[PDB]
Design a protein around this ligand. Structure first.
Ligand SMILES: [Zn+2]
Ligand SMILES: [Zn+2]
Lengths: 179, 434, 38, 126, 258
DNA sequence: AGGTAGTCACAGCTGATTGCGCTG
């Protein structure tokens, strides 16, 4: 796995060999008006029998509560244990491991307290972008070709977007501190 | 027999007529199993039938047995009926009469179960709840004493005939009082609500001899079951047969009524408990009863030896001889254990086993002593020259169902005396045809 | 012997208090001893 | 020998069961024990049964009494427990032992059982 | 001997129901009260031994609410209607407090269950559950009391079921998850009675047999001591375990211990 | 036809005999 990870990051020009082992080692009085109105409305209140439920409402509720309904959804990842074959699942696991390691390096670099780390974080972001372009885009193309219904790439996209937003916010703070 | 067993044996017309009264529907619904009640409540507001598969998918796979039992019981009680859904499907929908009356009982609608109580104003001779309970106890004790035959308790002739029809007491010779049978002892050993229910079921079965409507009697009984204790109800609005049934209930102690012409009647705790602790048991085979009436003392003495009789306490010892005598009288050990557990003192209820296991096990073992030897009269055949001849005769005996015991190793068989002639004729004919 | 084991087990295991208790079972933890709970 | 047997009965995991013949029917220095299995005690000695029970108490523990059905030992056991039931003890009746046929026990077949009659009748102390 | 106790907590916040009436929607407080009464009547119908309690949660305080129809049901419904009328008609807005006192209602429900359990005879076990219908928004100021109530309910093995109408409540989700209850959000308000009868009517033993909706995504966001707001990441003390949104050189709670 | 002193089993104790061990 480590050798496979090394090839996918160094041979594919995602990261340099030097950097690879370096890391390894409410409203106005209208509310009172509404309260008065509801108090007056409920002052003359009587129990009801027909209006409590209707045949249409009960049928709709049973349809919702029947299997395959909104609340009782029956699909819910039917055969993901066998969907998207394990050959792709192994590749997805490898991508998850690579993303986890790169983000671990990024979050270990954070917070940036010295000017040396500033270049290191930029290099880490460049490595993340190169890894994304190298692996995720062909992975997304393969998924679209196979038309997989699962949004496997979505979590990786969310993690990358969170890291990029954090870095952009930190850069914006750094620029404002120098103003 | 419980209520559901009797209801399931009635014709569909009687069941349909019963559901026309809201009180009957509530009793039937409460008699249902736990799973059936949820299905009834879910389908209470449905105007369309549901697929059978959809209903079957509500319960998990492991509990499918309970689902099948509940569905079968509902079908037998005719609460819902099969509907031919278009497209070859089968739909289940509640009975419209039963559903309407159940909703009326729950939500509301129509007129009250009783006519009124304020028309005649307050009762001039109203009693209290403890007084009503004492009256019910006195009536039930009088009935059970009349079962024994003491001259102090004198009841109506028809009440005695009802016991005669129930088989508890048989009048072999006219003029002399009937003698209680073993079934009478077993009935006495039963608890009071079960005794009342058995008596009412016998009354329902034999009502056809008196020409009384079963549906009306059942509806009135169910209405009495849900009646509020200590509250009077209107006699008016009932048929003449219902008046006679109410008088019989008053004789039974279920209903209190000052006069036959009175327009008020007070349901008692027996009537409320009709639809549905003073004995201390010790590990040293001793019984302590906090009772004073002769009835409980006699019932406990039926299967135990009395030692002391305090004004408010009875000290008794359960011995082997007393239990054996009670079993010889016809009372089984299970009935004794049930009676002890039902009458158990509230203190004994604290232990997870209400009755200590040693006493119950000892009583059960004492019951098994009597039936150690099993007796079956019969005729023994041991003159079989060949195994093949024995096999044919044994097969013929098993076909006739007159076999008692078989021994293939020693070619020995035992047959009932009634089938002995048939077996002899079959054996003789085989030799003649040879 | 093969049959001797079966005959002895049948005689011993079900002599007096089994020809009736088993019939009742067919027709129908705190106080249980440790060997009866295993 | 008795002293050394009783001494090695307690502080030894290899051996943890001993047999006593009317010797422990008094107050001795027997170590703490949990299980007592009495077979063929005296006739109706409530004192002996109470003493034997006292060697166990010190469900932490449990003591068994083995009797033979349809024999005088039944009446002896019945009449020798009336002291303990007065003390408050309840004697549960055990008719079947769970897993009796699960494992192998002695006298499995009828041959050795009927051979045991020869040796048990061989006393002939006349 | 199976005694089931069903304490129903009704969110009777006047402001939310007033806004609902202003919206002129098909669902009002009257229909909700009718559905609650019908559910209680069904619960009493299921068995003789079943016991019912209805508690109305209001801004001022918590109010114990409890002709062809059943006699006991008639009296129960009349008492419920009288109590809800007395609560709503005499409910005068005096103060800026708007959040519903849900925690106090649950505490009163737990106290009532504790009282009922002792009065239950020793031969019977009283299984108790609490059903809550949520109308107004969740209250963050009551986080600690709500958590204490959840823990007390879990200690006594009391189910807490939430029936959210409009806005989800994280506290109710946590209560349902911890106590083993069911959390359900009603999509169509007029179907409230049918939802209650289909889902919350069966007991926990009956819930085992029946197939029920899976638990919803329960959140576990904590409440900051100095802000009382939902937070994702916060500073937690090591001595008193108090949670803070920002770092402080001296813990405020540890000041108590000298 | 009924009841109390021998008697057997199993244990205890104390009172003598009587039989094996007793130095780097
Ligand atoms: Zn803070
Ligand atoms: Zn602190």
């Amino acid at each position: 796995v480590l050798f496979q990870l090394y090839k996918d990051l160094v041979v594919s020009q995602v990261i340099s060999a030097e950097e690879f082992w370096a890391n390894r080692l409410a409203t106005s009085q209208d509310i009172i008006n509404s309260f008065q109105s509801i108090r007056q409305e409920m002052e003359a209140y009587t129990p009801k029998l027909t209006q409590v439920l209707s045949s249409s409402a009960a049928s709709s509720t049973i349809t919702a509560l029947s299997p395959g309904g909104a609340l009782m959804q029956g699909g819910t990842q039917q055969a993901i244990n066998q969907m998207v074959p394990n050959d792709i699942q192994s590749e997805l696991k490898h991508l998850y491991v690579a993303v986890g390691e790169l983000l671990r390096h990024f979050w270990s670099c954070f917070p940036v307290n010295t000017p040396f780390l500033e270049e290191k974080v930029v290099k880490m972001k460049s490595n993340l972008e190169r890894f994304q372009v190298t692996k995720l885009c062909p992975f997304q193309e393969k998924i679209r070709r196979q038309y997989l219904s699962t949004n496997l790439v979505s979590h990786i996209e969310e993690m990358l977007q969170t890291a990029y937003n954090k870095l952009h916010t930190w850069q914006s703070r750094r620029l404002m501190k120098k103003t | 027999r419980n209520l559901q067993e009797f209801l399931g044996g009635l014709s569909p017309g009687v069941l349909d007529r019963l559901y026309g009264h809201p009180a009957t529907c509530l009793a039937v619904f409460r008699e249902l199993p736990s799973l059936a009640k949820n299905w009834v409540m879910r389908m209470l507001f449905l105007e369309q039938p549901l697929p059978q598969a959809a209903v079957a998918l509500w319960v998990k796979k492991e509990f499918s047995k309970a689902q099948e039992e509940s569905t079968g019981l509902l079908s037998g009680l005719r609460i819902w009926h099969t509907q031919l859904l278009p497209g070859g499907l089968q739909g289940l929908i509640l009975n419209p009469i039963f559903r309407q009356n159940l909703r009326i009982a729950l939500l509301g609608g129509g007129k009250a179960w009783s006519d009124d109580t304020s028309q005649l104003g307050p009762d001039k001779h109203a009693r209290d709840v403890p007084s009503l309970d004492k009256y019910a106890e006195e009536r039930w004790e009088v009935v059970l004493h009349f079962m024994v035959g003491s001259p102090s308790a004198a009841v109506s002739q028809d009440l005695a005939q009802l016991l005669s029809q129930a088989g508890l007491m048989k009048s072999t010779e006219p003029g002399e009082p009937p003698c209680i049978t073993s079934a009478g002892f077993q009935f006495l050993l039963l608890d009071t609500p079960a005794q009342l229910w058995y008596f009412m079921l016998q009354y329902l079965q034999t009502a056809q001899s008196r020409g009384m409507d079963l549906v009306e009697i059942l509806s009135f009984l169910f209405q009495l079951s849900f009646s509020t204790l200590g509250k009077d109800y209107s006699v008016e609005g009932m048929s003449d047969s219902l008046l006679n049934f109410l008088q019989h209930l008053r004789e039974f102690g279920l209903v209190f009524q000052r006069k036959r012409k009175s327009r008020r009647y007070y349901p008692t705790r027996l009537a409320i408990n009709l639809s549905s602790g003073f004995i201390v048991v010790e590990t040293n085979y001793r019984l302590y009863a906090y009772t004073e009436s002769e009835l409980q003392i006699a019932l406990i003495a039926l299967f135990s030896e009395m030692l002391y009789r305090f004004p408010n306490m009875v000290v008794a010892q359960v011995t082997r001889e007393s239990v054996q005598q009670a079993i010889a009288s016809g009372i089984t050990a299970q009935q004794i254990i049930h009676f002890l557990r039902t009458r158990a003192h509230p203190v004994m209820l604290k232990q997870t086993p209400v009755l200590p296991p040693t006493i119950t096990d000892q009583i059960r073992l004492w019951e098994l002593e009597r039936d150690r030897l099993r007796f079956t009269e019969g005729v023994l055949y041991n003159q079989f020259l060949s195994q093949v001849d024995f096999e044919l005769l044994l097969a013929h005996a098993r076909e006739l169902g007159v076999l008692v015991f078989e021994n293939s190793a020693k070619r020995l068989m035992v047959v009932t005396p009634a089938g002995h002639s048939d077996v002899k004729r079959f054996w003789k004919r085989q030799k003649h045809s040879s | 012997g093969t049959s001797s084991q079966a005959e002895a087990a049948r005689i011993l295991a079900a002599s007096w208090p089994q020809n009736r208790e088993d019939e009742e079972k067919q027709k129908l933890a705190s106080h249980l001893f440790p060997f009866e709970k295993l | 020998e008795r002293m050394q047997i009783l001494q090695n009965f307690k502080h030894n995991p290899k051996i943890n069961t001993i047999f006593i013949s009317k010797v422990g029917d008094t107050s001795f220095d027997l170590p703490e024990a949990n299980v007592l299995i009495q077979i063929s005690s005296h006739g109706g000695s409530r004192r002996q049964e109470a003493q034997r029970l006292g060697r166990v108490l010190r469900y932490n523990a449990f003591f068994y009494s083995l009797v033979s059905q349809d024999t005088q030992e039944m009446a002896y056991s019945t009449k020798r427990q009336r002291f303990l039931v007065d003390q408050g003890y309840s004697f549960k009746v055990i008719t079947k032992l769970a897993g009796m046929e699960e494992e192998d026990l002695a006298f499995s077949t009828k041959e050795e059982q009927q051979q045991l009659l020869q040796k048990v009748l061989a006393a002939t102390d006349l | 001997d199976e005694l089931n106790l069903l304490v129903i907590v009704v969110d009777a916040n006047p402001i939310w129901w007033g806004k609902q009436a202003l919206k002129e929607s098909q669902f009002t407080l009257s229909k909700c009260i009718d559905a609650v009464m019908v559910l209680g009547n069904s619960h009493l119908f299921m068995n003789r031994s079943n016991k019912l309690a209805v508690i109305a949660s209001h801004i001022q305080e918590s109010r114990f609410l409890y002709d062809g129809k059943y006699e006991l049901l008639t009296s129960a419904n009349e008492v419920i209607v009288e109590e809800i009328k007395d609560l709503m008609t005499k409910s005068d807005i005096k103060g800026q407090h708007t959040e519903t006192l849900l925690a106090g209602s649950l505490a009163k429900a737990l106290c009532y269950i504790h009282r009922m359990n002792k009065e239950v005879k020793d031969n019977q076990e009283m299984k108790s559950r609490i059903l809550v219908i949520k109308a107004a928004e969740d209250s963050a100021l009551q986080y600690m009391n709500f958590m204490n109530v959840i823990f007390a309910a879990q200690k006594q093995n009391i189910l807490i079921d939430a029936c959210v109408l409009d806005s989800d409540s994280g506290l109710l989700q946590q209560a349902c998850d911890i106590t083993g209850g069911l959390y359900l959000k009603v999509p169509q308000m007029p179907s409230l009675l049918q939802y209650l009868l289909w889902v919350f009517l069966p007991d926990q033993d009956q819930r085992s047999q029946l197939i029920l909706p899976p638990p919803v995504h329960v959140d576990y966001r904590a409440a900051c001591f100095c802000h009382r707001n939902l937070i994702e990441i916060g500073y937690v003390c090591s001595v008193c375990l108090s949670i803070f949104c920002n770092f402080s050189p001296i813990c405020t709670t540890c000041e108590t211990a000298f």
